Amino acid sequence: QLTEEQIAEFKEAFSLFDKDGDGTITTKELGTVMRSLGQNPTEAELQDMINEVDADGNGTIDFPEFLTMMARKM
Numbered sequence: 556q557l558t559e560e561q562i563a564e565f566k567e568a569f570s571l572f573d574k575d576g577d578g579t580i581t582t583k584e585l586g587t588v589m590r591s592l593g594q595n596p597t598e599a600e601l602q603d604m605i606n607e608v609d610a611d612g613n614g615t616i617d618f619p620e621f622l623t624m625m626a627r628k629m
């Protein structure tokens with residue numbers, strides 16, 4: 556299970572790139588969020604993630620979908 560500390564850190568790193576504070580980021584900023592967490596995904600691995608959290612291809616990711624995908628990755 557994710558810990559409270561993991562959820563809080565995932566939230567904080569995401570929020571660094573949510574400039575308008577509405578709980579969404581662009582798919583182009585997902586790698587920057589992951590690197591902010593000290594991870595180093597490949598472009599490949601980023602594409603697979605974007606495939607899970609931006610199924611419709613609108614180029615946005617909300618925090619709930621980011622968090623469950625990370626739960627699955629961790």
Ligand SMILES: C[As](C)(=O)[O-]
Nearest residue numbers: 575576577579615
């Ligand atoms: C009003 As908007 C598309 O910048 O969240």
Ligand SMILES: [Zn+2]
Nearest residue numbers: 575576577579
């Ligand atoms: Zn917005």
Ligand SMILES: [Zn+2]
Nearest residue numbers: 617618619620
């Ligand atoms: Zn959503």
